[PDB]
Paper text:
To investigate the structure and activity of proteolytically cleaved Vip3Bc1, we performed a trypsin digest to yield two primary digestion fragments of ~68 kDa and ~21 kDa respectively, which we term activated Vip3Bc1 (Vip3Bc1act). Mass spectrometry analysis indicates that these fragments are formed primarily by digestion at K205. We obtained a 3D reconstruction of the digested complex by single particle cryo-EM analysis to a global resolution of 4.8 Å (0.143 FSC threshold). The structures reveal that Vip3Bc1 to VipBc1act transition requires extensive conformational rearrangements, but consistent with previous biochemical analyses, retains its tetrameric state8 while opening an approximately 5 Å pore. We were not able to directly observe density for an extended alpha-helical bundle in our single particle cryoEM reconstruction of Vip3Bc1act, however we were able to use deposited Vip3Aa16 coordinates to generate a model for Vip3Bc1act EM density due to high sequence identity (59.9%). We observed that Vip3Bc1act associated with the membrane in an elongated ‘open umbrella’ conformation, ~15–18 nm on its longest dimension to the membrane, with a stalk interacting with the membrane and the bulk of the protein density distal to the membrane. B Scaled comparison between segmented density for a single particle in the tomogram, with 5 nm scale bar (i) compared to Vip3Bc1act model (ii) with an overlay showing the stalk density fits the 4-helix bundle well, and the density which is distal to the membrane is consistent with single particle Vip3Bc1act model. The helical stalk modelled in Vip3Bc1act does not account for all of the stalk density observed in the sub-volume. Following cleavage, inter-subunit interactions at the conical tip of the complex dissociate, allowing for helices α1–α3 to rotate and move down through the gap between the ‘propeller’ regions of adjacent monomers, and form the extended helical bundle at the base of the complex, as visualised via cryoET and consistent with the reports for Vip3Aa1616.
The Vip3 (vegetative insecticidal protein 3) family proteins from Bacillus thuringiensis convey toxicity to species within the Lepidoptera, and have wide potential applications in commercial agriculture. The Vip3 proteins have molecular masses of ~90 kDa, and are secreted as soluble proteins that form tetramers in solution. They can be proteolytically processed by trypsin or insect gut extracts to yield products of ~65 kDa and ~21 kDa that remain closely associated in solution. Vip3 proteins are proposed to exert their insecticidal activity through pore formation, though to date there is no mechanistic description of how this occurs on the membrane.
Numbering used by the authors:
A (entry chain B), B (entry chain A), C (entry chain D): 141 to 198, 214 to 803
The structure:
Amino acid sequence: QNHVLSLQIEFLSKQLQEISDKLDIINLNVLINSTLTEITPAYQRIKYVNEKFDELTSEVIENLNELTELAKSVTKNDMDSFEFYLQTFHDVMTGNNLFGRSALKTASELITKENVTTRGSEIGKVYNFLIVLTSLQAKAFLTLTACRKLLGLTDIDYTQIMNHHIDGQKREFRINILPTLSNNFSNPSYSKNRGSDIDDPIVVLEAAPGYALIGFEILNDPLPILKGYQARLKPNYQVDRESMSETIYGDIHKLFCPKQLEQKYYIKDIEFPEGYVITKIVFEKRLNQLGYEVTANFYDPSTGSIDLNKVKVESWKEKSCEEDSCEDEYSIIKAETDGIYMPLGVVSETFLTPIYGFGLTVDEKNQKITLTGKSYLRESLLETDLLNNETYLIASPDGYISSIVENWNITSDNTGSWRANNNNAFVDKADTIKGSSSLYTHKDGEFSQFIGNKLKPKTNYVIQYVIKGRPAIYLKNNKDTLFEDTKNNFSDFQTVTKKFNSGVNPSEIYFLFKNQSEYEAWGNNFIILEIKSLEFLPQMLKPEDWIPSGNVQMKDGGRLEILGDGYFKQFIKLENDSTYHLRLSVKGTGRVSIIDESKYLLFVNVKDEDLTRVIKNTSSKGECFIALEGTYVENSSTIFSNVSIVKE
Amino acid sequence: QNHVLSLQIEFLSKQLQEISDKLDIINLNVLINSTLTEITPAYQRIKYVNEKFDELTSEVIENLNELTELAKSVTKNDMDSFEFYLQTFHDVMTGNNLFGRSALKTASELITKENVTTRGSEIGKVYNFLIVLTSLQAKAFLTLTACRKLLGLTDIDYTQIMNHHIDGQKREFRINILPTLSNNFSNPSYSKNRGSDIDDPIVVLEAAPGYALIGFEILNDPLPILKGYQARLKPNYQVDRESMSETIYGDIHKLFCPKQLEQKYYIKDIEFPEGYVITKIVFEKRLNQLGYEVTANFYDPSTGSIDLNKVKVESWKEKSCEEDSCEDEYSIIKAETDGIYMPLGVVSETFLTPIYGFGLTVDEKNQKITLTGKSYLRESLLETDLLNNETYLIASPDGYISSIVENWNITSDNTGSWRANNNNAFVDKADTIKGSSSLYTHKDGEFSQFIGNKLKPKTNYVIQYVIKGRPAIYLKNNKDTLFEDTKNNFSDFQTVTKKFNSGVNPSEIYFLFKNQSEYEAWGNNFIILEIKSLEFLPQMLKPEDWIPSGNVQMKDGGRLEILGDGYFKQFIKLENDSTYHLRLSVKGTGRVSIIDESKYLLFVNVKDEDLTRVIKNTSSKGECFIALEGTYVENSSTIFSNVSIVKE
Amino acid sequence: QNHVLSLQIEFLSKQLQEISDKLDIINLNVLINSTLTEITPAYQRIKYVNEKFDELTSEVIENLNELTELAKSVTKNDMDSFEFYLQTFHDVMTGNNLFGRSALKTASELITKENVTTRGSEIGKVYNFLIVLTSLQAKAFLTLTACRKLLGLTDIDYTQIMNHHIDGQKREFRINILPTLSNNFSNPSYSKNRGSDIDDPIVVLEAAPGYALIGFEILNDPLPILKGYQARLKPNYQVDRESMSETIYGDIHKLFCPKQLEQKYYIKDIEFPEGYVITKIVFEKRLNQLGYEVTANFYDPSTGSIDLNKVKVESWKEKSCEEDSCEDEYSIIKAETDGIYMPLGVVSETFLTPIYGFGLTVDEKNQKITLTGKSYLRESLLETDLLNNETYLIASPDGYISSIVENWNITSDNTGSWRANNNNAFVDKADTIKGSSSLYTHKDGEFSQFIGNKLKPKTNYVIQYVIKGRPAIYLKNNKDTLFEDTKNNFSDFQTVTKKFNSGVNPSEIYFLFKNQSEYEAWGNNFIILEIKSLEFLPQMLKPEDWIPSGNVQMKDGGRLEILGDGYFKQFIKLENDSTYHLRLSVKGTGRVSIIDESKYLLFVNVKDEDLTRVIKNTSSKGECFIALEGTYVENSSTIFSNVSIVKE
């Protein structure tokens, strides 16, 4: 009963903590209400004046008169003038109020609390809040200069006042707000997909010797796949806009998700000292023990050059290695059925930036995977924008940046390698809207483009395309349309991704973006790229030493289909002190037999399942062969998939 | 003492929950204060401009000049213009603020908390909040066009801007607000009226063939009464107006409230898959066991046309699927001496829709008898106004819509049912000048209307009507009056909700609304409808085989008077393995008799009270009957009340 | 230890209650912030316009031009006009906002919480809040009419709009706010003074047969004294302005405060039915058992007549009498030394009103006295102002309303019975300020007034006077200045109260408000009235049956000073079955002796103390005499004060 009272008191202490959190949210909302009462009339007026003067700071007589009257209202020297609202906005931003509170402080406190589903860090969110307000004021001073010029009044030079206002606010942020926080983020969201276990996958993300890795990306709309970003770096941990890349990878769910068997994920914030940039991250999943490799070459921060010889390496992935180099302290996961919470979305920073540290922080208690990096972000922005230089600051990549299709983002009214094969297939910057060219094709239009020369045989490719109407999408080599999408009619530019294995001869594939059989079709942003197939670590089995025994044929995936009476055997050498993870998946019922010479080291029936037999320390006298003797009947088709006796 | 400490800790946990609820109300009020600080100056100005331009968007030189000056102020292109206030209203509504909060979100959070005495659902309340704001903006753009035209300025076409503003707000509602709610509904209040335990009230709530039942309603002012509605079901789970109707049942306190004996309440959440619409409910209270058999039919969501072939009947049998004691899944309400808190008011859904589920949700902790059905309203709207096609929306009613009196209130200028017998006894207003439509009689006044052909012998009818001044209500055939009220001179149009029993031969009873005196009279809203006499489950007592034995005769209420001495006798075969329950009250000191050929299976006298007898194994030797006798007093005519020998 | 845990949990439950109270205060402050955000810009502008147009709605050309320009701004038909601010003020008051909250509701919730040191009830405070806002709007419509007339514009008749606004707000108050509360208040504050115990005080507060008691008052600046209010009543529990009175009483601390001995204060809400008005309240303190008497004659509410024969009486004061008429259930107080928390301030309602009920709710746990009345206030205001008739509504009396000095509030530049005896003693409406005449007398001024004819011998009088400068205050009969105040110089009209026993001949006392010896003097509000001396209940001792025995003399207070060798004896009759509270206080050491004939029923020495010997049931054979034999020496002066052998 005293134990029951203790549990009830622990329940009360939890309720009091939830109450104390609710109070901290309420107190903050009260401080937001104070700053809104101070800043809202100025913010709303500045916004309206900035929006209504967009063309001039970027019917003729009517709008010019309607704007001239507004300009007279704006430049008027009243107590309630536009200059009054600009000054009060600056004062509330800095904290020159009745009680010394700043709008930047209450905003920073807000962002720190409501950072629930936020992609980036507290510094980057509070700084983005500062950027939108400084841009609003700068545009407001620009409209005020434009209004004075339009009326023919004298130039007051608001550059000095605007600079004093912007610098004082950046100084308030630097002194009282920024001694904030940390450079660690993760993947945006989680997803449940299925992978593999009898595989030995391995994935490297290495940047060019002049590049550093500038981000990641995982999409699963065609299939779960890792997209890898890297680019040449500019001074002060800045990045060159061109040379940025997105590196599509294999069935990344495989290396991510298990199949009803445990996983080994080591946990450590690999971090090298400053200036060191990780131009390569390997990943290695062998026997479901998924490791990786984070190593950083140095980078001279001042001159955009990454060092090409001063590598720093942490071969292991676990915090136990950070002190002992003994491979332990992973995170073990008992595999859930539907699929592990694989990362979904884009693994990058709001601004592409060299990361110096990275850590794996999977939380198997919820079967959820989480990462943690460490980047030079404070040391990249702290020198250029916070010192107000030529800002080379580029937002994060949401999706695809390029395409195998040239001019895929047709936006300047040009075809390029596209081919305007009709007078309804005219490039038409305003195909359906001048917001973007999206090649117009109505009732006979066709835009063609050779894409096959880049389509290479026995390789999967990704395709996406922003298409209005019912477009005639074609991946055709004039003989075999490796993929065609002429099915959907889209009034609202619906874009989706699929896959296809480039056939034996894709090297002739034209893209033929025609209209349709007949409809009104539009389309741009024809993102097509190559889907990498996942590679795997070695083994002891080989697709060549197999000895077919009649009515048995091997397939493209080394599949060795048992077409009936017969088998494949492979003389493999097994040794006394060595262990062997014999692992294989079958399509169609059958058996597998390791007859050394007379003894059955292994003989089991396989219907459709992942074999995982770990052949223990056993001396195979002479040579043993895994006689892949599937079912022995006419309609027997025992298609193995992964021939792996991979030795422990 | 440890048990006392546990109870004190449970009291602390309740106090902490009340504190956590208070914090959630406070946090919401703080978020309302933020949105008020943002939106109030625009809302107030839009409202004032909309109200002051009503005739123009629906003394002349003065009003025209004052409105022309107002129009010059409204159309003026300042920073503080009417267009500024419209744009800021749109931005605060969508969430384009300093911190990304929308007025629609804080309003939805408000309505979700203060839904205490709200008639309709969260969706319908938040959508009604959206409608009043969108209408306010649309009228504001309309006054702005009217002001430009009045001044003679160029037309700017604000239809495009208004549509963009309205659609963006409806999109915000559809995406970020609407993906919340439930569709339960219950009674608002409760009533205490001593019901029945002597009787077995079974009540059927069945819809017409083309109808489904579309609401409940509980009355106590005329009497404990069940009010009901039923109507055709249109396409899209909406309901046909003109096919609605009313049905009124008797003493439903006797159906729900027990009197001085406990009542069993089969909590039975009868629910059906989608497409099913309740075409029948039976409520079953035998031996105070309030079960209820319900039969819902299926219904084609589109094209209306409830299909009368796919029915389901889950009477009490949701626990039959899991437990032999299907007699479980109930509750126990103990009848205190004033009755039980039967519902009072209305168990219905905000807007008219088929209900699919129903359950019994009594609360004997407060005697709170609560009905609860499951409506299709969520569906009935998510497809209609969310798509903005027809929105055939009718909210739930409150009083009687159906009346035997034709032109029950008045249509207008025409009382074709009534008779304007006198010229001066005209209709007082005749068009919208005296509040609502209402008859009027003065110094001779009368209004005759034949409804005797619509009145049945010996049946209870509930009466409602609204009257002002000096009225003389009459319901007569110029020879006897069924209902009359010519008193209580009142202020303005007060409502009656009472009952009466229709006469023994009312085939000629017509209504004669006259004047109370030589003064002027007013009245309207004459509601007349039948009250279905409460009907009970049959038991082996039938009045015909009664043998009136000695100065006696069969009576009306199933009563069997005993004038002085004598009795009523009738043979009823009791069994030696079955239990019977003789439940009967008397008016006059009586003696009931359960005697065998020699011995007294029961030996009881009844003075003026009921009789609750649970007879154990009734050893039966053939001869079983009851001699419903009184005692040897000349004055007290023994008059039993309710024959019920119900065979357990 | 479990008991210690229970006490700790009770401490936690108290902390949670203090937290829940803090939340209710916070939630209310958040609702006040919402209404302030809605109503503040309108309230401030209405207030400024009302204050700046005061002389017109009550430097010629310059003020007229500045007000004409202001009037042009006020009457201007803009979106931000004065009419806009009036309409928005009305809408926020009624609750026609974005979310349906009314300023009247949040204000009522405020007043209900912050009613800590509030004199009147919740109804009267919330109604006073409604009055100040309705008056603000009415004055605002009035300034708007005045501004239109001043500019020469057409009359718009804002009476209709103003009436609609005022009536709609009074309707909101009547429906949603007023079904509020209760008619019970108490004394405003508490005070620690000292009284008496061996006294038998008794105080009646009876209104004239045409009057009802209209309030109370207790002041203690000269000495703690009760001031009693009563007046003839006007229809609907209204009061005639004249005939109001203030009835000064005795040393009310005496009847209020004990002297180190217990008190008996009975507790009951004496309440008679409606129309019954308490035209008399007796109070009786005998043997420290302080009782009273609250009896109510009827009052025909319609015609201002109190009934003069239909008395209703509750002779006792205790709730035990309200059911048994057995004198018990008092509140007993163990007397504190410094003094009981006697009522300080004015015991009345904010508006003078007939009280029908009254209760004593002393709280001796804090030694604090509290009262509780029940008045017809809702039924007096509910008919006149809430029906908008000629409001005869008079605020509560703070201090004195009249004076024995005629024209005491010299305000119309007239002396009256005052006498301007100098050309520096000129009445001078602007003596020092035209805000009030306050008779000016500089360096020779004198104002004289005969006040002695009303000053009656051997009676105490109260005096107060609002005086600037050093005034020559005189209560002089040209031979003996019974009191004179020529001492203080007051720049700021400092007024104070004192006392004086009118001498053997006060009937000639002139008031001679001269200046001074010489200074600048001012003065008005010469409140002078008669200080009643406290009377007492009877006893068995008598000041006449005393038998002096040489060197002994009686004084004015029946004091019987023992001037040395000698005594007073008084043959008193004591009986067997009777008890006698012999009680007496002495000045100077001495003794008292009750020699019956030979036996010492009582002989004790008395130095300076309250004798309280309760002579028990004792048969005095023949006659006994209390031989007041004080100290027997030359310098013996044993001045007894209260000769009371008052028989139990």
